[PDB]
Amino acid sequence: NLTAAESRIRDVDMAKEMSEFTKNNILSQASQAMLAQANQQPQNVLQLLR
Amino acid sequence: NLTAAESRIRDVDMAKEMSEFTKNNILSQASQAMLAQANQQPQNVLQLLR
Amino acid sequence: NLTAAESRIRDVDMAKEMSEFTKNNILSQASQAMLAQANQQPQNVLQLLR
Amino acid sequence: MRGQIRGLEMASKNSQDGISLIQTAEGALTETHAILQRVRELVVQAGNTGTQDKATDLQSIQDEISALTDEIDGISNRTEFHGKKLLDGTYKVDTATPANQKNLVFQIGANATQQISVNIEDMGADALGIKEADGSIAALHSVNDLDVTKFADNAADCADIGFDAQLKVVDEAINQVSSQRAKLGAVQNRLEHTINNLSASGE
Amino acid sequence: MRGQIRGLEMASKNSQDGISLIQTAEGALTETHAILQRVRELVVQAGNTGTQDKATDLQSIQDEISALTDEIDGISNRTEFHGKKLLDGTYKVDTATPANQ
Amino acid sequence: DNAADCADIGFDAQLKVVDEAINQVSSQRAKLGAVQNRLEHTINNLSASGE
Amino acid sequence: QDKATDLQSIQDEISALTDEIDGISNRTEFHGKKLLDGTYKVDTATPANQ
Amino acid sequence: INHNIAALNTLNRLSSNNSASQKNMEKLSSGLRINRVGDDAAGLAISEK
Amino acid sequence: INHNIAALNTLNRLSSNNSASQKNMEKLSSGLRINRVGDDAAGLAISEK
Amino acid sequence: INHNIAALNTLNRLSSNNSASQKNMEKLSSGLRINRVGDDAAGLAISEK
C-alpha cells in the first residue's frame, strides 16, 4: 500500500505525459510557424519602399 | 546546471537572433532606398539649370 | 575492471556523440544559411548602381 | 524605459541562474537524502541485530554507517556553485547575530528592493536540536550513530543509547533535509513565475 | 482644428500606452492566479491529508504554501510600470476617505 | 558585504545613482534637443523677416 | 552567486566603460572647444565663471 | 514599425512551450514527476518519509 | 540555443538506468545481491562470518 | 547645395545596420553571443572559469 502510494505520488502517467509531450511539441512548432509568417511583413514594407 | 548556465551565457536565442537578422537587413535595404531617393534631388537642380 | 577502464577511456558515449553529431551538422548548415544571406548584399549595391 | 527593459531581460537571466544554483543544491540534497535512506535501513537492522548479532558485527555495521557519514560531510563540503559552498553552515538560517546570516538575495527585477532571500543549512551535524544541535544526542546521531556497542546496553530507555531516540533523530535529519529540499523547489516555482512576469513586462 | 487633431493622435498613443500598462498588470495577475490554483490543490490534499497525514507533514505543505504566499506579496510589491507599483494598495477601489483613491 | 543597507555598499543606493546619472544625461539631451527645436523656429522667423 | 573575484572582473569591464565616459567628455569638441566637460557648469558658485 | 515585431510574444511563447517539452522529457525519461525536487515539494517530502 | 539540448539529462538518466540494468544482470546471472562487495557491506560481513 | 547631401547619414546609418547584420551572422553561424571576446567580456570570463 505504501509502495502504491509513493508510486501514485512519484510516478508518471507516461501515456498521459506522452500525449502532453506531443501536445507541447505541436505548440512549439506552431509558434515557429507563426514566427516564420511574422518575419514576412517587413519585406512587404520594403516592397512599399521600392 | 553549469552546462546550462554556460549555455545561457554563451549560446544564442537563434530564433530571436534571426528575427533580429531579418530586421537589420530590412533596415539596411531601407536605408539603401533612402539613398536611391537621396541621389535624385541634384538632378532636379540640373533641370532648374536647363 | 581493466577492460572497463580501457573502455571508459577508449570508447564513446555514442548517444552523446550522436547528439553532438546532429548539433555540429545544424551549426554547419546554419552557417551555410548565413552564407546564402551574406551573398545578397552586393546585389543590392548593384541595385543602387542601377 | 529602455534601461528598465534591458535590466528585465537581465532579470530573467538572473532568476534562471538562481534556479540552476538551486538545482545544484537539490542534486546534492538528493544524494544526501538517499544516503539517509540507507542509514535508516542500517539503523533498523541495527535494531534487530542488536538482539541477534554481537557488538563486533554492530561495529562492522557502524563502519558502513560512518563511511556514509563521511560522504554526508563530503557532499556538504564539496557542493559548490561558482566555487561557493552552499550546503555548509555559511548560510545558517538564523545566526545568533543576525548580521552573520549572509543571505542569498538574488536579483529578480530591474529596480531597487526587487530581490528574494534564500537560506541553506546542512552538514554531518544536521540532526535534531533547538539553536545548536545538542551534545551527546542530536548532532552525532547523524555524525556518529550510536550502534557501536552501546546499543546492546538498552532498548529504548536512555535517550542516548535507546533505539527509539536514535531512529527518531534519523527521521528528524531526514525531516530537515526534506524540508530544505521542499523550500528550495518552492523557490524554483517562484522564480519560474517571476520569469513569466518579466517576460510580460518585456512585452 | 489642427490642435484637436494632433491631440487625437496623441490620444491614440495615450490609450495604447494604457493598454500596455494593463497588459503588465494582467501578466502579473495571471501568474498570481496560477499560484492560487496551486494553493487550491494544496488545500484540497490538505483536506484529505488532514485525515491521513500528521501535523508535521501539514507543516511541510504549509511551508510550500507560505512560500507561494511570499510570491504573491512579491508580485504585488514588484509589479511596476514606469516604476509605479500597480497591484499594491495604492489604488484601493474605495478608500474610506474617497480623496485617497 | 551588504545588500542595500549601507548607502555606499548597498545595491539600491548604487543602482539608484546609476539611474540618477542616466536621469542627468537624459535631462541634458532633452534640453539640447529642445534648443534645436527653438532654433528651428528662429530660422523660420528670420526667413519671414528676410521676405 | 559569484565570488569577489568575478565581481572584480565585472568591475574591470565597468571601469573600462567609465574611462570611455571620461574619454567622450574629454574628446568631444566642436571647433576644438570641449563642450561636455565642466567648462560650462550650469551654475558656478561664482556666477561670473559660467 | 520595424524594430519591434508583435510576434516576439511567439518567441517567449516558444521558449515556454519548449520548457514544457523539457519537463516532459525529464518526466518520461525518468518516469518520475518528482524527478527534480521542484514542481512537487510537499508530495516529495511525503513520498520521502 | 543549439549547443546545449535540455535532454542531456536524458543521457545521464540513460546511463544511470543502464547501470541499473547492469547491476540487475550481475544479480540475475549470479543469483546474488552480494555479487560484488559493494551494495551490501554489512550484510556481506555478517553473511561471511 | 550639391557637395553635401543630407543623406550621408543614410550611409553611416547603412554601415551601422550592415555591421549589425555582421554581428548577427557571427552569432548565428556560431550559435554564440560570445563568439568574439568583445560584446560580452564579464559574461565570457564567468563562462570560462
Author numbering:
A (entry chain A), B (entry chain L), C (entry chain B): 255 to 304
D (entry chain V): 52 to 254
E (entry chain f): 52 to 152
F (entry chain r): 204 to 254
G (entry chain r): 103 to 152
H (entry chain A), I (entry chain K), J (entry chain L): 3 to 51
From the paper:
There are three parts to the flagellar structure: the trans-membrane basal body that functions as the motor, the connecting rod and hook, and the flagellar filament that acts like a helical propeller. Our current understanding of supercoiling in bacterial flagellar filaments, referred to as polymorphic switching, is based upon the notion that protofilaments within the flagellar filament can exist in two discrete states, that differ slightly in length. The “short” state results from a protofilament having a right-handed inclination (the R-state), while the “long” state results from a protofilament having a left-handed inclination (the L-state). To reconstruct filaments at high resolution, all protofilaments must be “locked” into the same state, either L- or R-type, producing straightened filaments that lead to non-motile bacteria.
While the three L-type mutants (E115G, S285P, and S17P) have a left-handed 11-start helix, the four R-type mutants (N226Y, A233V, H84R and A39VN133H) have a right-handed 11-start helix, and the designations L and R correspond to the hand of these 11-start helices. The L-type 11-start helices are tilted left by ~ 1.7° and the R-type 11-start helices are tilted right by ~ 3.9°. Strikingly, we found those sites are not necessarily conserved among different species or participate in unique inter-subunit interactions. These include three straight mutations outside of the D1 helices: S17P, S285P (both within D0) and the double mutant A39V/N133H (within the loop region). We also identified several straight mutations that are only involved in the 11-start interactions: S17P, H84R and A39V in the double mutants. We calculated both FSC plots in the A39VN133H dataset and found that the model:map FSC (4.3 Å) is similar but more conservative compared with the map:map FSC (4.1 Å).
